[PDB]
Design a protein around this ligand. Structure first.
Ligand SMILES: COC(=O)[C@H]1O[C@H](O[C@@H]2[C@H](O)[C@@H](O)[C@@H](O[C@@H]3[C@H](O)[C@@H](O)[C@@H](O[C@@H]4[C@H](O)[C@@H](O)[C@@H](O[C@@H]5[C@H](O)[C@@H](O)[C@@H](O)O[C@@H]5C(=O)O)O[C@@H]4C(=O)OC)O[C@@H]3C(=O)OC)O[C@@H]2C(=O)OC)[C@H](O)[C@@H](O)[C@H]1O[C@H]1O[C@H](C(=O)O)[C@H](O)[C@H](O)[C@H]1O
Length: 342
């Protein structure tokens, strides 16, 4: 039994369908009864914010149903202010029990074209993060199955509660999965992208930048997945598995890198190509305005039974025991929530 509350399509010959996704979402009665929207094949140039609980999107196919918009953090609004990282997102989830299935979500900000611009070009953006998908502090129980997420810097922003990504593709360069949420990935392709702007010998990017609060049990957990290069031009040892993001945060004694954001990234049973060199450090500003470095050895960065050419075991790459690995099942990570589609 599968039935839709609204249908979106590019055709008028399709019949009684909405022309935009935003229109179909807005049409949902107020409340928290399930609302299921079918999205037919096409590229929908839209930015969406989801505030209704129990909303569900289903694309006709991952290959053909695309929601896309180009916005960087350094892109300017009408009032001349920057959008910022959170504000750059193509899709923002600020509701509970959201699901998306069989669709692609992109931030189309052309990072390589931006980097190729001359340094004196006033249109060259420095704040190059450009989020495809953002799950906010208000999001919990967000389920993404057979979804593709496309960007370069800062593709996926996972904050708030629990999110589950299954049979997914996520592509990016720098910190392309980041934030303080509980985010479980199973059977996903994590695609590290080529950077034309990076000198031979320098780092191209980092898969994760977790900012998990030290008192939160689970951050970014990646299971049964594949960590792959976009192309043969992505150099060996060009990508880190993670670096520790301590976000600038307003405290009673000022605004500075959160010392208690000691992020967790755990890889279990995951293949890795040789573009991976291991973990890395990251800097912030301290309470005095000085540069402070946060080291991977002080973070919750672990692996369990990685394989492929990028899976080396050393003192700089801590490994879980069998008993420790048993703490990272779906049941333990997601707790009482069983992700289900309508
Ligand atoms: C989600 O989090 C983020 O997206 C993240 O974004 C920002 O990160 C910065 C930057 O965008 C990112 O690309 C990365 O950059 C590093 C490095 O930090 C940067 O200086 C640059 O370095 C290279 C090279 O890697 C290095 O070895 C060296 O090289 C030599 C020499 O020094 C140099 O001058 C040149 O001649 O080359 C020499 C050589 O060896 O050949 O320097 C070069 C260089 O170009 O320097 C000028 O590129 C690096 C890189 O590309 O790595 C893949 O990280 C940056 C960073 O961490 O800066 C502190 C942002 O800065 C981060 O804070 C983070 O942003 C989030 O958090 C913010 C916060 O305040 O908490 C905000 O909230 C923000 O909105 C949010 O997104």
């Amino acid at each position: 039994a599968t039935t839709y509350n609204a249908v979106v399509s590019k055709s008028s010959s399709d019949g009684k369908t909405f022309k935009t996704i935003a229109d179909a979402i807005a049409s949902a009665p107020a409340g928290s009864t399930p609302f299921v929207i079918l999205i037919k094949n096409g590229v929908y140039n839209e930015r969406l914010t989801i505030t209704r609980n129990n909303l569900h999107l289903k694309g006709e196919s991952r290959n053909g149903a695309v929601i896309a918009a180009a916005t960087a953090a350094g892109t300017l609004k009408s009032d001349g202010s920057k959008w910022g990282t959170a504000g750059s997102s193509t899709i923002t989830i600020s509701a509970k029990d959201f699901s998306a299935q069989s669709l692609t979500i992109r931030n189309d900000f052309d990072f390589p074209a931006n980097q190729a611009k001359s340094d004196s070009d006033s249109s060259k953006i420095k704040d190059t993060q450009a989020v495809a998908l953002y799950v906010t502090k208000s999001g919990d129980r967000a389920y993404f199955k057979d979804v593709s997420l496309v960007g370069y810097q800062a593709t996926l922003y996972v904050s708030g509660g629990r999110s589950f990504f299954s049979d997914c593709r996520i592509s990016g360069t720098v910190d392309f999965i980041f934030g303080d949420g509980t985010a479980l990935f199973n059977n996903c392709d994590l695609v590290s992208r080529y950077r034309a702007d990076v000198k031979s010998g320098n780092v191209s990017g980092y898969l994760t930048a977790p900012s998990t609060n030290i008192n939160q049990k689970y951050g970014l957990v990646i299971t049964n997945s594949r960590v792959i290069r976009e192309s043969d031009s992505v150099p060996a040892k060009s990508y880190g598995l993670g670096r520790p993001w301590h976000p600038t945060t307003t405290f009673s004694d000022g605004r500075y890198a959160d010392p208690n954001a000691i992020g967790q990234t755990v890889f279990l049973n995951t293949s890795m190509d040789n573009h991976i060199y291991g973990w890395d450090k990251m800097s912030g500003k301290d309470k005095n305005g000085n540069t402070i470095w946060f080291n991977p050895e002080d973070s919750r960065f672990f692996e369990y039974k990685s394989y492929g050419a990028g899976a080396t075991v050393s003192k700089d790459r801590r490994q879980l025991t069998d008993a420790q690995a048993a703490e990272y099942t779906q049941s333990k990570v997601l707790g009482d929530w069983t992700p289900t589609l309508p």
